[PDB]
Amino acid sequence: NQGDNEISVGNLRLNVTRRLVWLGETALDLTPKEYALLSRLMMKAGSPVHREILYNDIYSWDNEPATNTLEVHIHNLREKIGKSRIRTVRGFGYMLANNIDTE
Numbered sequence: 882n883q884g885d886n887e888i889s890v891g892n893l894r895l896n897v898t899r900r901l902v903w904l905g906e907t908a909l910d911l912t913p914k915e916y917a918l919l920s921r922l923m924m925k926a927g928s929p930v931h932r933e934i935l936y937n938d939i940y941s942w943d944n945e946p947a948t949n950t951l952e953v954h955i956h957n958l959r960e961k962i963g964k965s966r967i968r969t970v971r972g973f974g975y976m977l978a979n980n981i982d983t984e
Contacts, residue, residue: 890926891980893966895919904963914939915958922967922975929974 887896894903900916902909911919918935936943936951959967970976 888923890923890977891966891982893923893977895923904966909961909963911958911961915961918955918958919962922977926977927979929970929976931974935975 884898886898887894889895892905896902897920900913902911902916902919917938921935921938922930924930932955935955966978968976968978
């Protein structure tokens with residue numbers, strides 16, 4: 882917050898100051914919206930993050946989306962973040978590998 886703020890988890894680096902995220906030392910291209918919900922995923926890297934808090938990241942007014950689209954948008958963004966370096970925990974939340982690769 883002091884004009885600087887960034888965090889990393891394994892081979893993934895995040896920078897809220899510039900609002901950019903790297904993956905495998907390569908700059909990953911994700912829409913700004915994903916950076917908000919994603920910023921929450923890393924905020925709690927080690928446990929399953931509720932899916933409602935992510936939706937609350939950009940807005941928690943919850944209108945009345947009866948048609949499927951909010952969960953599908955995540956499926957579209959899912960391929961952008963590369964599920965490879967991510968780990969989903971059942972249909973309840975998401976969790977990043979807390980450097981589980983290095984034993």
